[PDB]
C-alpha cells in the first residue's frame, strides 16, 4: 500500500506513469540531482530505458527489486547500489543499459546524440574512470570529424577499447577492426600530445 501511495504522488494525471514533472519531484525528494550517477543506477534497476519516465510496472518492479516502498527506503539502498554497479558483470550490464536508456526510441533513433553519448559516457564511468576517457570525451566535444551520433556497436566496443589500450597507446593497432572513430581519435590524440 505504501508503494501505491508513493507511486500516486509522482504519477502523471493522465498516463499511468511517472513523466518529467513527477520524475523531477521524485529526484528532489530523494535529494539527488536528476542527472547524477545514482539516478542512472535507479533507472537501471527499474529497467526504464526511456529517459524521464517510469511506467507503473517499472516503478513497482524496480521498487520491489530493491526492497523499498518509500523515499527513505530507496535512499538507504544507494550505497549498496553503488557497490553493486562496481562488480564486473553488473557494470557490463549497466553499461549496455545506458546506451538503450540514452536512446530516444520515441522517434525513434538508432544512435545516441553525440552530446548525450558524451554525458552518458562520463556518467556511466563515474566510479571507474579509464585512463583514456578524459581525452576521448575532449575529442568528441571538439568533434574533429563531424559525426552525428554514436551507434550501438561503437558504444559496445568502446568498453573493450578502454581495457585494451592506454595510457600508453602501446597496444593500439590501426589494422584492428575497431570502429573507425577509434582511429580518428588515436590520430587526434597523437596530434594533441605533439602540440603539448
Amino acid at each position: 500500500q505504501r508503494l501505491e501511495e508513493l507511486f500516486r504522488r509522482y504519477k502523471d494525471e493522465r498516463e499511468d506513469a511517472i513523466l518529467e514533472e513527477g520524475m523531477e519531484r521524485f529526484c528532489n525528494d530523494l535529494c539527488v540531482d536528476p542527472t547524477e550517477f545514482r539516478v542512472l543506477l535507479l533507472a537501471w534497476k527499474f529497467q526504464a530505458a526511456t529517459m524521464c519516465k517510469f511506467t507503473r510496472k517499472e516503478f513497482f518492479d524496480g521498487c520491489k527489486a530493491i526492497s523499498a516502498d518509500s523515499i527513505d527506503g530507496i535512499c538507504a539502498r544507494f550505497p549498496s547500489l553503488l557497490t553493486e554497479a562496481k562488480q564486473e558483470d553488473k557494470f557490463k550490464d549497466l553499461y549496455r543499459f545506458t546506451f538503450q536508456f540514452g536512446l530516444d526510441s520515441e522517434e525513434g533513433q538508432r544512435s545516441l546524440h553525440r552530446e548525450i553519448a558524451i554525458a552518458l559516457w562520463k556518467l556511466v564511468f563515474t566510479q571507474n574512470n579509464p585512463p583514456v576517457l578524459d581525452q576521448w570525451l575532449n575529442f568528441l566535444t571538439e568533434n574533429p570529424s563531424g559525426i552525428k551520433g554514436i551507434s550501438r556497436d561503437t558504444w559496445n566496443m568502446f568498453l573493450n577499447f578502454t581495457q585494451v589500450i592506454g595510457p600508453d597507446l602501446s597496444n593500439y593497432s590501426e589494422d584492428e577492426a575497431w570502429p573507425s572513430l577509434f582511429d580518428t581519435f588515436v590520430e587526434w590524440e597523437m596530434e594533441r600530445r605533439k602540440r603539448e
Binding site: 518529467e20 542527472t35 539516478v39 552518458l120
Partner: peptide
Amino acid sequence: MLTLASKLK
C-alpha cells in the same frame, strides 16, 4: 535524466 531540463521547458 539528461533530457529532463529540456523536457520541462
